[PDB]
Coordinates of C-alpha atoms in Angstrom, one line a residue:
Chain A
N2 CA 22.8 -17.4 12.7
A3 CA 19.2 -14.6 14.1
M4 CA 19.7 -12.2 10.5
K5 CA 19.6 -15.5 8.5
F6 CA 17.0 -15.2 6.3
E7 CA 15.1 -17.6 4.0
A8 CA 14.8 -15.6 0.4
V9 CA 12.9 -16.8 -2.0
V10 CA 13.1 -16.5 -5.5
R11 CA 10.0 -14.0 -7.1
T12 CA 8.2 -16.0 -10.1
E13 CA 5.7 -13.4 -11.4
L14 CA 6.6 -10.0 -11.4
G15 CA 2.9 -8.7 -12.6
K16 CA 0.0 -7.2 -11.8
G17 CA -0.9 -8.6 -7.8
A18 CA 3.0 -10.4 -7.4
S19 CA 3.2 -7.6 -4.5
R20 CA -0.3 -7.9 -2.6
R21 CA -0.4 -11.3 -3.3
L22 CA 3.2 -11.5 -1.2
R23 CA 1.6 -9.2 1.1
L24 CA -1.4 -11.3 2.2
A25 CA 1.0 -14.5 1.8
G26 CA 3.0 -12.6 4.4
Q27 CA 5.9 -11.0 2.1
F28 CA 7.2 -8.6 0.4
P29 CA 9.6 -8.2 -1.9
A30 CA 12.9 -7.7 -2.5
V31 CA 16.3 -6.8 -4.7
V32 CA 19.6 -8.2 -4.4
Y33 CA 22.3 -7.4 -6.3
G34 CA 26.4 -6.1 -6.8
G35 CA 29.2 -7.4 -7.9
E36 CA 29.3 -9.3 -11.4
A37 CA 26.7 -11.2 -10.1
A38 CA 22.9 -9.7 -12.0
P39 CA 20.4 -8.9 -9.5
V40 CA 18.3 -11.6 -7.9
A41 CA 13.7 -10.6 -7.1
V42 CA 13.4 -12.0 -3.3
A43 CA 11.1 -12.7 -1.5
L44 CA 11.3 -12.2 2.3
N45 CA 9.1 -12.8 5.4
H46 CA 7.2 -9.8 5.8
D47 CA 6.7 -9.5 10.1
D48 CA 10.6 -11.7 10.6
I49 CA 12.8 -8.8 9.1
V50 CA 10.4 -6.0 10.5
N51 CA 11.4 -6.7 13.9
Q52 CA 15.2 -6.7 13.3
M53 CA 14.7 -2.9 11.4
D54 CA 15.6 -1.8 15.0
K55 CA 18.8 -3.3 15.5
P56 CA 21.8 -1.4 14.2
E57 CA 23.5 -4.5 13.1
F58 CA 20.9 -4.7 10.9
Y59 CA 22.8 -2.4 8.7
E60 CA 25.3 -3.9 9.1
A61 CA 24.9 -7.1 7.9
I62 CA 22.4 -9.9 7.1
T63 CA 22.4 -12.9 5.3
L64 CA 20.0 -14.0 2.8
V65 CA 19.5 -17.7 1.9
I66 CA 18.9 -17.7 -1.6
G67 CA 18.1 -21.4 -2.9
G68 CA 20.2 -23.2 -0.6
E69 CA 23.2 -20.1 -1.3
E70 CA 23.4 -18.7 2.2
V71 CA 24.4 -14.8 0.8
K72 CA 25.3 -11.3 2.4
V73 CA 23.8 -8.6 1.7
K74 CA 23.4 -5.4 3.8
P75 CA 20.8 -2.7 3.4
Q76 CA 20.6 -0.4 1.5
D77 CA 19.3 3.3 1.6
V78 CA 17.7 4.0 -1.0
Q79 CA 13.3 4.8 -0.7
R80 CA 13.1 7.9 1.6
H81 CA 10.5 6.1 3.6
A82 CA 11.2 2.6 3.2
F83 CA 7.5 1.8 6.3
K84 CA 4.9 2.7 4.7
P85 CA 0.9 4.5 5.8
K86 CA -0.3 2.8 9.0
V87 CA -4.2 3.8 7.3
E88 CA -5.0 2.6 3.9
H89 CA -8.7 3.7 4.3
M90 CA -11.6 3.7 7.2
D91 CA -15.4 3.5 8.0
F92 CA -17.5 6.7 10.2
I93 CA -20.3 6.3 10.9
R94 CA -22.7 9.0 12.3
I95 CA -24.4 8.6 15.6
Chain B
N2 CA -11.2 20.4 18.9
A3 CA -8.5 17.9 19.3
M4 CA -11.1 15.2 18.0
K5 CA -12.2 17.3 15.1
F6 CA -11.4 16.3 11.5
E7 CA -10.8 18.6 8.4
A8 CA -13.0 16.9 5.6
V9 CA -12.4 17.4 1.5
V10 CA -15.4 15.2 -0.2
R11 CA -13.7 12.9 -2.4
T12 CA -14.7 13.9 -6.0
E13 CA -12.2 12.0 -8.2
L14 CA -12.8 8.1 -7.2
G15 CA -11.0 5.3 -9.4
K16 CA -7.3 4.3 -10.6
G17 CA -5.0 6.3 -8.9
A18 CA -6.2 7.9 -7.4
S19 CA -6.4 6.6 -4.1
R20 CA -2.7 7.0 -4.1
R21 CA -2.6 10.6 -5.4
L22 CA -4.1 11.3 -1.5
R23 CA -1.4 8.9 0.2
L24 CA 1.1 11.0 -1.7
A25 CA -0.3 14.0 -0.2
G26 CA -0.2 12.7 3.6
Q27 CA -3.9 11.5 3.0
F28 CA -6.2 8.6 3.3
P29 CA -9.7 7.1 1.2
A30 CA -12.3 7.4 3.9
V31 CA -16.4 6.6 4.1
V32 CA -18.6 8.1 5.3
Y33 CA -21.9 6.4 6.1
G34 CA -25.0 6.1 9.1
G35 CA -28.2 6.9 9.9
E36 CA -30.8 7.4 6.8
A37 CA -28.7 9.4 5.4
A38 CA -26.4 9.0 1.8
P39 CA -22.8 7.5 1.7
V40 CA -19.9 10.7 1.4
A41 CA -16.3 9.8 0.7
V42 CA -13.8 11.9 2.2
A43 CA -11.1 12.0 2.4
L44 CA -7.9 12.4 6.3
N45 CA -4.9 14.0 6.7
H46 CA -3.2 10.9 8.1
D47 CA -0.9 11.6 10.5
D48 CA -3.5 13.2 12.4
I49 CA -6.4 11.1 13.2
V50 CA -3.1 8.4 14.1
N51 CA -2.1 11.0 16.8
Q52 CA -5.2 10.7 18.3
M53 CA -5.8 6.8 17.4
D54 CA -4.4 6.4 21.3
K55 CA -6.9 8.0 22.6
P56 CA -10.0 6.3 24.0
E57 CA -12.1 9.3 23.2
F58 CA -11.3 8.7 19.2
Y59 CA -13.0 5.5 19.5
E60 CA -16.0 6.5 20.9
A61 CA -16.6 10.4 19.3
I62 CA -15.2 11.9 16.3
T63 CA -16.0 15.1 14.6
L64 CA -15.8 15.8 10.9
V65 CA -16.4 18.9 9.5
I66 CA -17.4 18.2 6.4
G67 CA -17.9 20.8 4.0
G68 CA -18.6 23.2 6.2
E69 CA -20.4 21.7 8.9
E70 CA -19.7 19.3 12.1
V71 CA -21.0 15.7 11.7
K72 CA -20.2 14.0 15.1
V73 CA -18.9 10.1 13.9
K74 CA -18.0 7.5 14.6
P75 CA -15.1 5.2 14.1
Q76 CA -15.9 1.6 12.4
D77 CA -13.4 -1.9 12.4
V78 CA -10.7 0.1 13.2
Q79 CA -8.7 -2.3 15.6
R80 CA -9.6 -4.8 13.5
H81 CA -6.5 -6.0 12.5
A82 CA -3.2 -5.7 14.5
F83 CA -1.1 -2.9 14.0
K84 CA 2.2 -3.2 12.8
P85 CA 4.8 -1.3 10.9
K86 CA 4.6 -2.0 7.3
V87 CA 7.9 -1.9 4.0
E88 CA 7.0 -3.3 0.4
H89 CA 10.1 -3.1 -0.4
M90 CA 14.0 -3.0 0.2
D91 CA 17.1 -3.6 -1.6
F92 CA 20.1 -5.2 -0.6
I93 CA 23.7 -4.8 -2.3
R94 CA 26.4 -8.0 -2.2
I95 CA 28.6 -7.9 0.7
Chain C
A3 CA 1.3 11.8 -23.2
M4 CA 2.6 9.5 -19.6
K5 CA 6.2 8.6 -21.2
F6 CA 8.9 11.4 -19.4
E7 CA 12.6 11.5 -20.9
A8 CA 14.5 10.2 -17.7
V9 CA 19.1 11.6 -17.0
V10 CA 20.7 8.5 -15.9
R11 CA 22.9 10.3 -13.0
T12 CA 26.2 9.9 -12.1
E13 CA 27.2 12.4 -10.0
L14 CA 25.0 12.1 -6.9
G15 CA 26.4 14.5 -5.0
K16 CA 24.1 17.5 -2.9
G17 CA 26.3 20.1 -4.5
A18 CA 25.4 17.9 -8.2
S19 CA 21.6 17.7 -7.1
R20 CA 20.8 21.7 -5.7
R21 CA 22.7 22.2 -9.9
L22 CA 20.2 20.1 -10.9
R23 CA 17.2 22.3 -9.7
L24 CA 19.0 25.7 -10.7
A25 CA 17.9 24.9 -14.0
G26 CA 14.2 23.5 -14.6
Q27 CA 15.1 20.0 -12.9
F28 CA 14.9 17.8 -10.0
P29 CA 16.4 14.3 -8.9
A30 CA 15.1 11.2 -8.5
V31 CA 15.4 7.6 -7.8
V32 CA 13.6 4.3 -9.4
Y33 CA 13.4 0.4 -7.3
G34 CA 11.9 -1.9 -7.4
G35 CA 11.3 -4.9 -10.0
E36 CA 14.0 -7.7 -10.6
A37 CA 17.2 -4.4 -11.3
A38 CA 19.3 -2.1 -9.0
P39 CA 18.1 1.6 -8.0
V40 CA 18.7 4.0 -10.7
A41 CA 19.4 7.6 -9.7
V42 CA 17.7 9.9 -12.3
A43 CA 17.0 13.4 -13.8
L44 CA 13.8 14.9 -14.2
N45 CA 12.7 17.6 -16.3
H46 CA 10.3 19.5 -13.2
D47 CA 7.8 21.5 -15.9
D48 CA 7.0 18.6 -17.7
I49 CA 6.6 16.3 -14.8
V50 CA 4.4 18.5 -12.8
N51 CA 1.9 20.2 -15.7
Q52 CA 0.8 15.4 -16.0
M53 CA 1.2 15.5 -11.7
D54 CA -3.2 17.0 -12.1
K55 CA -4.0 13.8 -14.1
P56 CA -5.2 11.0 -11.9
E57 CA -3.2 8.7 -14.2
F58 CA 0.1 10.0 -12.9
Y59 CA -1.1 8.4 -9.7
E60 CA -1.6 4.8 -11.6
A61 CA 0.5 4.2 -14.3
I62 CA 3.7 6.4 -16.2
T63 CA 6.3 5.4 -18.5
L64 CA 10.1 6.9 -18.1
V65 CA 12.6 6.5 -20.1
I66 CA 15.5 5.1 -18.9
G67 CA 19.0 4.9 -20.6
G68 CA 16.7 3.8 -23.7
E69 CA 14.4 1.9 -22.0
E70 CA 10.7 2.3 -21.5
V71 CA 10.2 1.3 -17.2
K72 CA 6.9 1.8 -16.0
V73 CA 7.0 3.3 -12.5
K74 CA 4.4 4.3 -10.3
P75 CA 4.8 7.4 -7.8
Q76 CA 6.0 6.2 -4.4
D77 CA 7.6 9.2 -3.0
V78 CA 7.2 12.9 -3.5
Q79 CA 9.2 15.9 -1.6
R80 CA 8.2 19.3 -2.0
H81 CA 10.3 22.2 -1.3
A82 CA 8.8 24.0 2.3
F83 CA 8.5 27.5 0.9
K84 CA 8.4 27.2 -2.6
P85 CA 5.6 24.8 -5.2
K86 CA 8.2 23.4 -6.3
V87 CA 8.7 19.3 -6.7
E88 CA 12.0 18.9 -4.9
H89 CA 12.6 14.9 -5.2
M90 CA 10.2 12.4 -6.2
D91 CA 11.1 7.8 -6.0
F92 CA 9.5 5.7 -8.2
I93 CA 8.5 2.8 -7.6
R94 CA 8.6 -0.3 -10.6
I95 CA 5.1 -2.2 -11.6
Chain D
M4 CA -12.7 -13.2 -12.3
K5 CA -16.3 -13.4 -10.5
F6 CA -16.9 -14.3 -7.3
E7 CA -20.6 -15.4 -6.2
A8 CA -21.5 -12.6 -2.9
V9 CA -24.6 -12.4 -0.2
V10 CA -25.4 -10.2 1.2
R11 CA -25.8 -11.1 4.8
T12 CA -28.7 -10.5 6.4
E13 CA -28.0 -12.7 10.4
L14 CA -24.7 -12.3 12.6
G15 CA -23.1 -13.8 15.1
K16 CA -22.8 -17.0 16.7
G17 CA -25.5 -19.1 14.7
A18 CA -25.1 -17.2 11.9
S19 CA -21.3 -18.3 11.4
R20 CA -22.0 -21.3 11.9
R21 CA -23.9 -21.9 9.4
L22 CA -21.7 -20.1 6.5
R23 CA -19.4 -23.2 7.9
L24 CA -22.1 -25.3 7.5
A25 CA -22.4 -23.8 3.7
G26 CA -18.5 -24.0 2.8
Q27 CA -18.6 -19.9 2.7
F28 CA -16.1 -17.6 4.9
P29 CA -17.5 -14.0 6.7
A30 CA -16.1 -10.9 4.6
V31 CA -16.2 -7.2 4.1
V32 CA -16.6 -5.0 1.0
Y33 CA -15.6 -1.5 1.5
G34 CA -13.8 1.6 0.3
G35 CA -15.4 3.2 -2.5
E36 CA -18.1 5.9 -2.0
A37 CA -20.5 3.4 -0.8
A38 CA -21.1 1.8 3.3
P39 CA -19.2 -1.4 4.1
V40 CA -21.1 -3.6 3.4
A41 CA -20.8 -8.6 5.1
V42 CA -20.9 -11.2 3.3
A43 CA -20.3 -14.8 2.3
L44 CA -18.4 -16.1 0.0
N45 CA -17.8 -19.6 -1.4
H46 CA -14.3 -20.6 0.8
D47 CA -13.3 -23.4 -1.5
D48 CA -13.8 -21.7 -4.9
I49 CA -11.8 -18.1 -3.6
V50 CA -9.4 -20.0 -1.8
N51 CA -7.9 -22.5 -5.1
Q52 CA -8.0 -18.8 -6.8
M53 CA -4.9 -17.4 -4.2
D54 CA -2.2 -19.0 -5.3
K55 CA -2.9 -16.9 -9.7
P56 CA -1.8 -13.0 -9.7
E57 CA -5.3 -12.5 -11.3
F58 CA -6.6 -13.0 -8.2
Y59 CA -4.4 -9.7 -6.6
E60 CA -5.1 -7.7 -9.3
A61 CA -8.6 -8.2 -9.8
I62 CA -11.6 -9.5 -9.2
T63 CA -15.2 -9.4 -9.6
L64 CA -17.6 -9.5 -6.9
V65 CA -21.5 -10.0 -7.9
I66 CA -23.6 -7.6 -4.8
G67 CA -27.0 -8.3 -5.5
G68 CA -26.9 -8.6 -9.4
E69 CA -24.3 -5.7 -8.9
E70 CA -20.9 -6.3 -10.3
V71 CA -18.0 -4.9 -8.0
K72 CA -14.6 -4.6 -8.8
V73 CA -12.6 -5.4 -6.0
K74 CA -8.8 -6.3 -4.8
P75 CA -8.6 -8.6 -1.5
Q76 CA -7.6 -5.8 1.1
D77 CA -6.3 -8.5 4.0
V78 CA -7.3 -11.6 5.0
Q79 CA -7.2 -13.5 7.7
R80 CA -6.0 -17.5 8.1
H81 CA -6.9 -19.8 11.4
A82 CA -4.3 -20.1 13.5
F83 CA -3.2 -23.5 12.6
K84 CA -5.6 -25.3 9.4
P85 CA -4.8 -24.5 6.2
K86 CA -8.3 -22.5 6.1
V87 CA -9.8 -19.0 5.2
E88 CA -10.8 -17.4 8.0
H89 CA -11.8 -13.8 7.5
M90 CA -11.3 -11.7 4.4
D91 CA -11.3 -7.8 3.3
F92 CA -11.7 -6.5 -0.1
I93 CA -11.5 -2.1 -1.0
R94 CA -13.1 -0.8 -4.0
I95 CA -11.4 -0.8 -7.2

């Protein structure tokens, strides 16, 4: 049950909602497929990321959405799942 | 040579300008210090990252700003722990 | 100005993508928000002619399925031997 | 939302203790075309607004009489205490 992650249904989706999650150690995600409508969730960033080097992570994981367990599979959609290391840097003259 | 990086002087600030650099494999930077005016520059992301493992990088590197070589020193780069980052994922129900 | 008409792609094969690029098009994908990912096709020259304006990287509108979807350019894939945009990612805002 | 930012004139242990005494925490403002500046912000004033999405959209730091539009870039909370140790703000 190590591949079992708690998912929180997102309330805010406007400006700064994603940045808010990041500073709270989270990141936004979308759960879809089937007859049920898509559900926007928030997952623990470092907890999810630490499993993304395991082959079975891309096979099947479990998201606990509001108590109910939901089996999902990550989709290869975005070109680069991992984002740039450096966003800004300061340099001092020596 | 290895610690020699091309620095393009930024002319466009404001909203969207930083994302534009990111989509071109670059990131915004500021060169300050001494008793001269600060200058906004753009650097190649991977070129810098591929040198951030070497101790010399944190001692002294050279930035080519407008054709002239400027000896600078990176500031507070090691402040935050560096980890793989994700800002979005897609999951399908199985 | 920053509003572009998008065509939903139903054929997602490698062949279909090249057939787009062969006629002023290029494949793109839209994801994020509270909706499932959507594969679309955009007019090449129309998009490219606006990628010099910094507000293109601020916020643009894609008309998908008769609906206006506010997105940001998330990724840009360019040709190795040509000045053509091969593929793009757009994230919803 | 506007927050009062005081440009720090002293650094170190004693300087930090005086900030923790005035109900303030150390913060850094960088980005744009200006040098990074170390500032001091009211702890409770900032923390009580970090539950609003507007705080992460755009806030204004009043630095030296100048209104500086910024975004909260990074945050450091205590190891087990419900308070903020340090924050980073990027200029927008």
